[PDB]
Design a protein around this ligand. Sequence first.
Ligand SMILES: CC(C)[C@H](NC(=O)[C@H](C)NC(=O)OCc1ccccc1)C(=O)N[C@@H](Cc1ccccc1)[C@@H](O)[C@H](O)[C@H](Cc1ccccc1)NC(=O)[C@@H](NC(=O)[C@H](C)NC(=O)OCc1ccccc1)C(C)C
Ligand SMILES: O=C(O)c1ccc2cc[nH]c2c1
Lengths: 99, 99
Amino acid sequence: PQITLWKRPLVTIKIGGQLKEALLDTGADDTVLEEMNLPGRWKPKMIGGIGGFIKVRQYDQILIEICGHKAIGTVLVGPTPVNIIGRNLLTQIGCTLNF
Amino acid sequence: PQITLWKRPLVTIKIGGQLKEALLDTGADDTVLEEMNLPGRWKPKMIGGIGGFIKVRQYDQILIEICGHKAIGTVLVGPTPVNIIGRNLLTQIGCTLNF
Ligand SMILES: CC(C)[C@H](NC(=O)[C@H](C)NC(=O)OCc1ccccc1)C(=O)N[C@@H](Cc1ccccc1)[C@@H](O)[C@H](O)[C@H](Cc1ccccc1)NC(=O)[C@@H](NC(=O)[C@H](C)NC(=O)OCc1ccccc1)C(C)C
Ligand SMILES: O=C(O)c1ccc2cc[nH]c2c1
């Protein structure tokens, strides 16, 4: 699709077999989602943003669908106020900025 | 341009005869710079991110060029480690996300 930016670019995602919604975020290096269980072993990570740092669990090689488009990569899970799809997954679906 | 997301989408901006660089940020409602010398007065404003909330300095009607595209809008000055072009200005240059 082509998504204009008059409102937040929230889209449907599927992860862990569950439909969620998440922000397509070109200002995020990483993907950070709300609390959920994911397969495999996680490792602790800190991520920083506006306001400071938070503690997350890093899961590698996770399947996610973003508007039906499949990506595999690292998903961070933790107490974020919004589900964020970062560049690590945006690149996998061939997402670009255009003007 | 059509900008891929393998690295941060930093672009040249011009504000008050100063060239800077800033991140094209679809996850930012607002535009936030670390500094400028924006014409005098400002209004306080709160913004939030992943780590919590921060007070910033709001300036209205600021003229900015983003990759040579002229825009006018609100610019916040706040504790961001990276200059951020948010959706309030991305819309003005016709920027979209595409996949
Ligand atoms: C999501 C993270 C993985 C992401 N960070 C990174 O990519 C990394 C790895 N961080 C990194 O490099 O950190 C280095 C660092 C950290 C701390 C100190 C010094 C240096 C990030 O926070 N990125 C932000 C910018 C940034 C980039 C690099 C370093 C630091 C900050 C966004 O682009 C990102 O899009 C977030 C996503 C987000 C949205 C909503 C909630 C939480 C997070 N938006 C924002 O932080 C913006 N906020 C907002 O747009 C919101 C939601 N609105 C808002 O506040 O509106 C007004 C309002 C709200 C509430 C009440 C009243 C008014 C902000 C830049 C303006
Ligand atoms: O999920 C956790 O138990 C946890 C605890 C501490 C840290 C530090 C970074 N990530 C963490 C996750």
